[PDB]
Structure 1
């Protein structure tokens, strides 16, 4: 205590005395003006820095496909499900193999591949496993395949001599991630995730409760419609597979720890038919995207190996992490032709946390819902009328740009956008994004400041944009959103000028 004191006074007692006998005179005005001169604090204005140097964006290689599964290009294999066969979910593939799946085999010579022979071998070990039992019977291949590594350790105590005698080339280094540039594909991915798929519903949603006329009617109705719109979408598909598969792994981690297991990549859906005829039924089924392999390592992060089917030609710029093969040919048809099959392979890391939060992807619906509903209520509440149904169909939301012209869709179809956005927010969540948004808000607030002519200001915009830049590394979404925010700033500047365009 008697040497913890701040003042020139050393004993506590004297500090005590100066504290107890304190009466402060107005010299703090002068202290504060002197503090002010020394401060040179920035009295900033918005009209002066309105430019914000647009937004800075990194330059380099085009960002790659960070999502654990491929979406747009991914291919399905349909199977009409039995309640007692499908219940296992693990046997799904075993019953798939009896179909065509067993036939497919890739060639040794691959397009755009990094480690062909390993993956090609493994494929055969999977296929071979499936026949007997969905577990890979390997003690040694597992350890390599995890590695593709261990680093043998040395005690400090004996190391003193090897410092004095520098052998094995002794040094210390840590590495950073290489910056990437704005993606092109992402737009197309979004445009695909938006549109309705032929299959009807993916995410298993529970039943509806008994309802009173006053509120329950409204809620039940709104829900049935919204679900009805969003279940048809491709976005929902990927949610479905995510949930069902990550769920399947989440079991396997308890079922067989320290073991190598073949887990499918599947989604469940029922096809709906409204041709107005008495059909056999709406078709009840599950479809497969590819095969997945578990490898338990390190508690900590699991290592996972993904194999997906696809009908589309690979792109080196975005699939750089992916290793592609030429698998064979698959049949596709319609009536009012068989195309070559490509097998996409990769390895990834899955944290238990990521397993947990990616398994509960349903949540994304809710965050949309609130956002959607609120608009209808805020609108309807002005006129004191039921404008939900009207607002949903009549209120126009700005969705995109085409031929240099600003496009808008009705809130029922511009809903899909929000859902996609929220799903991507679930998938592409890196600490980069987190920061990106949590500094991005400030831009939005300043923007709406300018909208309603509130004459805003921001103290060190260079510094803000530096923190924004700083959190932009290699995150496709994170970057996408930046580049989109640019165009926002631009079109906004075009409407009402409190910004810059280069």
Structure 2
């Protein structure tokens, strides 16, 4: 205590006295003015720094496909499910293999492939396993495949001599991630997830509760309609496969730890037919995207090996992590032609945390819902009328740009946008993204500050933009949103000018 004291006084008692017998004079006015002169604190104005140097963006290789699964290019394999056969969910593929799947085999010579032979062998090991049992009977191949590695350890005690006698070239270094540039494919991915798929619904939603006239009629109606719109979308498809498959793995970690297992990449959907004819039924089924392999390692992050079918030609710029093969030819048809099949392969890391949060993807619906619903109430609450139904169809939301012209869609279809946006937020979540948004909010607030002419100000915009820049590394979404905020700032500057355009 007696040497913990701050003041020139050393004995506690003296500090005690100055405290107890304290009466402060008005010298803090002059102390504050001198503090101010020394401060040179920045009295900032918004009109002056309104430019914000637009937004800084990184230059290098185009960012890759960080999502554990491929969406747009991914290919499906339909199967009409049995309640008792499918129930296993692990037998789904076993029953699939009796179909055409067994036929498909890739050539040794692959397009854009990083470790061909390994992946080819493994594919064979999967196919062989499926016949007997969905487990890979490997003790040694497992270790390598995990590696594609361990580092043998050395005691400090014995190490002192090898410092004195430097051998094995002793050193210490850490590494950083390489920055990437704004993706192009992302826009196309969003445009594909937005549009409705032919299959009707993917995310398993429960029944509806009994209704009283007053409130329940409203809630029940709104939900049935919104679910109706969003279940048809491809975004929902990917939500489904995510939930079902990550669920399947989450079971497999308890079922067979320290074991190698073959898990399918599937999603369940029922087809809906409204031709106005009495059809046999709306089609009830489950479709497959590809096969997946578990490897328990490290508690900690699991190592996973994804294999997806596709009908589309691979793009080196975005599929860099992916290793492509030429698999064969698959039939596609319609009536009011078989296209070659490519097999995309990769490896990735799954934290148990990521397994959990990605498994519960349904959450995204909710954050859309609120966001949507609020708009309808706030609007209708003005006219004190039921304007929900009217507002959904009439109220126009700015969705995109085409031919240099600002486009807008009704709230019901621009709903898909928010949903996709929330789904991506789920998938593409990196500490980068977190920092991005949590600093981006300041931008948005300054923006609306300018909208309603509130004459804002930001103290060190260079510093803010520096933190924004800092959190932008190699995150497709993060960067995408950056570039889209640029275009925002632009069009906004054009409407009312308290911003810059280069």
Asked whether the two chains share a fold, i.e. TM above 0.5, the reply is: yes
Residue by residue over 1:380-405, the C-alpha shift from the partner in whole angstroms, topping out at 9 and shown as x without a partner, is 00000000000000000000000000
1:11 Cα offset (Å): 0.2
1:198 Cα offset (Å): 0.1
Residue by residue over 1:418-458, the C-alpha shift from the partner in whole angstroms, topping out at 9 and shown as x without a partner, is 00000000000000000000000000000000000000000
Residue by residue over 1:151-180, the C-alpha shift from the partner in whole angstroms, topping out at 9 and shown as x without a partner, is 000000000000000000000000000000
- Equivalent residue, structure 1, for 2:364: 364
Residue by residue over 1:134-156, the C-alpha shift from the partner in whole angstroms, topping out at 9 and shown as x without a partner, is 00000000000000000000000
1:221 Cα offset (Å): 0.1
- Equivalent residue, structure 2, for 1:140: 140
In structure 2, the residue corresponding to 1:473 is in which secondary structure? coil
1:32 Cα offset (Å): 0.2
1:372 Cα offset (Å): 0.1
Counterpart CA distance in 2 for 1:480 and 1:367 is: 21
Counterpart CA distance in 2 for 1:434 and 1:473 is: 12
1:466 Cα offset (Å): 0.1
1:217 Cα offset (Å): 0.1
1:354 Cα offset (Å): 0.1
1:2 Cα offset (Å): 0.2
Counterpart CA distance in 1 for 2:190 and 2:110 is: 29
Equivalenced residue count is 502
In structure 1, the residue corresponding to 2:418 is in which secondary structure? helix
- Equivalent residue, structure 2, for 1:65: 65
In structure 2, the residue corresponding to 1:328 is in which secondary structure? strand
Tell me if 1:45 matches 2:45: yes
Counterpart CA distance in 2 for 1:142 and 1:4 is: 59
Counterpart CA distance in 1 for 2:435 and 2:214 is: 43
Counterpart CA distance in 1 for 2:177 and 2:283 is: 47
Counterpart CA distance in 1 for 2:38 and 2:211 is: 68
Counterpart CA distance in 1 for 2:213 and 2:426 is: 36
Counterpart CA distance in 1 for 2:213 and 2:323 is: 56
1:367 Cα offset (Å): 0.1
Counterpart CA distance in 1 for 2:384 and 2:126 is: 62
Counterpart CA distance in 2 for 1:30 and 1:247 is: 67
1:122 Cα offset (Å): 0.1
1:277 Cα offset (Å): 0.1
1:103 Cα offset (Å): 0.1
Counterpart CA distance in 1 for 2:303 and 2:336 is: 46
Moved beyond 4 Å, runs of 4+:
none
Counterpart CA distance in 2 for 1:257 and 1:235 is: 32
Counterpart CA distance in 2 for 1:210 and 1:399 is: 36
Residue by residue over 1:312-368, the C-alpha shift from the partner in whole angstroms, topping out at 9 and shown as x without a partner, is 000000000000000000000000000000000000000000000000000000000
Residue by residue over 1:17-51, the C-alpha shift from the partner in whole angstroms, topping out at 9 and shown as x without a partner, is 00000000000000000000000000000000000
Counterpart CA distance in 2 for 1:283 and 1:63 is: 39
1:238 Cα offset (Å): 0.1
1:272 Cα offset (Å): 0.1
- Equivalent residue, structure 2, for 1:32: 32
Counterpart CA distance in 2 for 1:165 and 1:173 is: 20
Counterpart CA distance in 2 for 1:462 and 1:304 is: 41
TM-score normalised by L of structure 1? 1.00
Counterpart CA distance in 1 for 2:285 and 2:168 is: 59
1:120 Cα offset (Å): 0.1
Residue by residue over 1:476-500, the C-alpha shift from the partner in whole angstroms, topping out at 9 and shown as x without a partner, is 0000000000000000000000000
1:94 Cα offset (Å): 0.1
1:309 Cα offset (Å): 0.1
In structure 1, the residue corresponding to 2:281 is in which secondary structure? coil
Counterpart CA distance in 2 for 1:138 and 1:422 is: 40
In structure 1, the residue corresponding to 2:289 is in which secondary structure? strand
Residue by residue over 1:98-148, the C-alpha shift from the partner in whole angstroms, topping out at 9 and shown as x without a partner, is 000000000000000000000000000000000000000000000000000
Counterpart CA distance in 1 for 2:23 and 2:186 is: 66
In structure 2, the residue corresponding to 1:264 is in which secondary structure? strand
In structure 1, the residue corresponding to 2:260 is in which secondary structure? coil
1:290 Cα offset (Å): 0.1
1:501 Cα offset (Å): 0.0
1:206 Cα offset (Å): 0.1
Counterpart CA distance in 1 for 2:198 and 2:388 is: 28
In structure 1, the residue corresponding to 2:398 is in which secondary structure? strand
Q: Which ranges of structure 1 fall in alignment gaps of 5 or more residues?
A: none
TM-score normalised by L of structure 2? 1.00
1:262 Cα offset (Å): 0.2
1:227 Cα offset (Å): 0.0
Residue by residue over 1:42-66, the C-alpha shift from the partner in whole angstroms, topping out at 9 and shown as x without a partner, is 0000000000000000000000000
Counterpart CA distance in 2 for 1:140 and 1:210 is: 57
In structure 1, the residue corresponding to 2:328 is in which secondary structure? strand
Counterpart CA distance in 2 for 1:169 and 1:259 is: 36
Counterpart CA distance in 1 for 2:466 and 2:157 is: 45
